[PDB]
Amino acid sequence: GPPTSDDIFEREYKYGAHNYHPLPVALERGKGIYLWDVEGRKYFDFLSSYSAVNQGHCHPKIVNALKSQVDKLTLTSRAFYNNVLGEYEEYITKLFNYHKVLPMNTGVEAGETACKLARKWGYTVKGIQKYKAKIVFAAGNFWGRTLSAISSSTDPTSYDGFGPFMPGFDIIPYNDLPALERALQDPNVAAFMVEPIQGEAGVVVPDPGYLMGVRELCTRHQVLFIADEIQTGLARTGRWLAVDYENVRPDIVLLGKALSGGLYPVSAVLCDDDIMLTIKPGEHGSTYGGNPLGCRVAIAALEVLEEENLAENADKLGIILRNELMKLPSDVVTAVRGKGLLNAIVIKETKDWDAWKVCLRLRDNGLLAKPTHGDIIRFAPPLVIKEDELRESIEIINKTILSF
Amino acid sequence: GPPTSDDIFEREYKYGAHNYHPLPVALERGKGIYLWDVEGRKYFDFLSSYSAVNQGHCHPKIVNALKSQVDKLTLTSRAFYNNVLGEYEEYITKLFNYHKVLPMNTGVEAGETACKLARKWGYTVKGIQKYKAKIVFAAGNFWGRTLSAISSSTDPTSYDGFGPFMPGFDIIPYNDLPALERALQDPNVAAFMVEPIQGEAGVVVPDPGYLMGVRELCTRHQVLFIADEIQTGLARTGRWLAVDYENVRPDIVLLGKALSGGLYPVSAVLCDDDIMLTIKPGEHGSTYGGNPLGCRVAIAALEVLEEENLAENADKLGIILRNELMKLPSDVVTAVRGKGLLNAIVIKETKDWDAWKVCLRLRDNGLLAKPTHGDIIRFAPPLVIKEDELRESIEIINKTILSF
Numbered sequence A, B: 001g002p003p004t005s006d007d008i009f010e011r012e013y014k015y016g017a018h019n020y021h022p023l024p025v026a027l028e029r030g031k032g033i034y035l036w037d038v039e040g041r042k043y044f045d046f047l048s049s050y051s052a053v054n055q056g057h058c059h060p061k062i063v064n065a066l067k068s069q070v071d072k073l074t075l076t077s078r079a080f081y082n083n084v085l086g087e088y089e090e091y092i093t094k095l096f097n098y099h100k101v102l103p104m105n106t107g108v109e110a111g112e113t114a115c116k117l118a119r120k121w122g123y124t125v126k127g128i129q130k131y132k133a134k135i136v137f138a139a140g141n142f143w144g145r146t147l148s149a150i151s152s153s154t155d156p157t158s159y160d161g162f163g164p165f166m167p168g169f170d171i172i173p174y175n176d177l178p179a180l181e182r183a184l185q186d187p188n189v190a191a192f193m194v195e196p197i198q199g200e201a202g203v204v205v206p207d208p209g210y211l212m213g214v215r216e217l218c219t220r221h222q223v224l225f226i227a228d229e230i231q232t233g234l235a236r237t238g239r240w241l242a243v244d245y246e247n248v249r250p251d252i253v254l255l256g257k258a259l260s261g262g263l264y265p266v267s268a269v270l271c272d273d274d275i276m277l278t279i280k281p282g283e284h285g286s287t288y289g290g291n292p293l294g295c296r297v298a299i300a301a302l303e304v305l306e307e308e309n310l311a312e313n314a315d316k317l318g319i320i321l322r323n324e325l326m327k328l329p330s331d332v333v334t335a336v337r338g339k340g341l342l343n344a345i346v347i348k349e350t351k352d353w354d355a356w357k358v359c360l361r362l363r364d365n366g367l368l369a370k371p372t373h374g375d376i377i378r379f380a381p382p383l384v385i386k387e388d389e390l391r392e393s394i395e396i397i398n399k400t401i402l403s404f
């Protein structure tokens, strides 16, 4: 017969690096909001592959886009033109209202690209002396695992044993406009990179007016505002971009994860000509960036978000979800936070009760969620979920919580 | 009607970043060794998407693996297990005879992973003081476009304007064993990372015995030998790994590009337990790394290379290609170099005549190649090419080169 779940666990333990400690579930099929493991059990997916499958698993429109293109052409490299890339470029730039896009594959590649743009613009436009340019980041940030990305992290698990670290990266507290203003007094700062909601830190939502104040300070001091929307973008928080809640237009927007509906690693860096064109031909690239197969699925993934009005659904259903989670007792859950369908709860963890235990029992009751800290659980189902599916999930959550 | 080639160029110029200056040809289909542009013209592909379509464009076996899996499950994220990853991990580790593999998406992510492994092993096993670890690179190296990767580059187009740079990277000449021996006197060196053939630098082939000498010096001084085979591996030079020509075993091997046959960004870091397990759960990863869709594609891509004996074909046909190119007059072609089907010619560049114009005319005569410097042209067709097709291509190259 086929492998069991324990077969799958031990094969990976023997032949794969040990860089992850996954929840013990061996999944074999996904469709829409549901996942199935190899034993045939069905689960509500309340992680959405860290918001990569906003459109649900294996969305038919995106799948058909991939199957149509894979028989024609999948990779020319950027040494030549292909017929798909410019169609995607015109589409995504008009959708988010920026001049240009630079295509990359993974989220951390988008962030590295943004750092390279900020520095090159800092030297060639702002007039910073080489190589004194600084980029400011917020404590709690997460944007990947390259040496550069971990050099801006305040989490020791990310950076311990991996130094020495990239110079020119400064860290300030999140949700702290006076701290930002102080940092931007230095004219060698080229950019501030920030998540409009910090996902990895525990769905940390900054105070109203924070994004508007970041925009005001960056513009005043001639500093690029880089908004990392790789997790928060693409309807997850109830808008095309989380910055849309305060009408804020960043200088550079990063997109990734759900840009492909989970079918292909596609990321994007959006900005206007005066920034984008500081990088000349030959000065930045990627083998697979902008390939025609990824472009076709990104177009379809974006079309799904717009056609099915998933931002409106995430906003309306997130209100219901937060409202129902807030009914849970306050000797069990200490806080409920989030926007749209990016939410989290904080449990009152004791010496013998934590969030990993809760998620194990949620899995036993047919709902998959992952804990982000010893006391925080994220709830992020695909945006295609309907109200009755959500209420059935809320039921599983309520029953699981108080069954402790 | 459909966009013309000029339409396609103009649209990318308007909506896409200008980080590339591609050869002006607009492809819409490819299969095997051939590409078709939107006007319907047919071309020999002598770039193979930088050796990512070693198996030829749209290889039916790889396409079938992608189409079969895209219906089932494409991305769970590493928070859970999927049933495919461990089958791939077992397959690739047994094929290359290393204990373990760490899956990533792009080549530069694999190189970043190797640098992190080297540093972590350097501090936790070798005993180097934090954070004094060094990694030595060879001048001319290329391993991607992150801030860390360009920090080791000697090509100003890669790094100029993008600093300040990552510390702890040292540079020595390529193909220079005395220089490596002198560099490895520093006990703080954790690793030497090197390409068995430098592709981006213009297909620079080191002297016989270089790789053996590298392995000897790295072992003698307790330094990790990291072999970057993202371009040279996977039958391109006539072996599973280019280091097989000298039968040496690196401590870490990097694979990328053709690991998917061009259908998906998949890369891999191979090494034994003593190195791999220095990275603990939660200390490294990637959203799309190890997803089931990429794994299914990679298994099929590797099976194609094995089943069709593409290494043997590249070895046999590459010597024919080089011998025929060497018959051109020295007034025109000053050097021919390569291994297997990774080859280049050096032309006698004048002020009126350069590699770009040769490649423009090659395109006019039905063959696509790209210059890597003003006087170097790479010739690297897919490894499924047949001898008669190669000889037809050689006639095109002869006619084009001698037509000036």
Ligand SMILES: *C(=O)[C@H](C1=C(N)C[C@@H](C(=O)O)C1)C(F)(F)F
Pocket: A077, A078, A079, A285, A286, A287, B050, B051, B107, B142, B143, B144, B199, B200, B201, B230, B231
């Ligand atoms: C691949 O072997 C190599 C290239 C990269 N690496 C990135 C790609 C690009 O710049 O788009 C080209 C080379 F050396 F060109 F072949």
